[PDB]
Design a protein around this nucleic acid. Sequence first.
RNA 1: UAUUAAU
RNA 2: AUUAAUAA
Lengths: 48, 50
Amino acid sequence: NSTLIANSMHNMAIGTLMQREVGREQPGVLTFLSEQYVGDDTLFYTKL
Amino acid sequence: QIILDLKIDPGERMDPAVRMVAGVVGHLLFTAGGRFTNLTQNMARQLDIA
RNA sequence: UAUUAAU
RNA sequence: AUUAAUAA
């Protein structure tokens, strides 16, 4: 009953750790302006 | 023998209410003058601002 | 229900 | 199977 919602929230958790780790390892390189999760699909709008 | 300072983390994200409440809590939890202290001067400044 | 877009 | 968009 809750397949899509759980999938998208797990994707959100993965993206959160992605942002945290890239901020830790390479500070000041990428800034994140937008994050979108619709299931297994992830989209980012960033400035390099 | 041990004094405290504030830690700054860009990855941390929190509600501002946490900082404003910690402003009240710090004045009741710590000693900052007279005969000894538990805090640095910068830490006391930040608590005063909070 | 009918068709289609997506997952 | 699940949510939508039109038609009826």
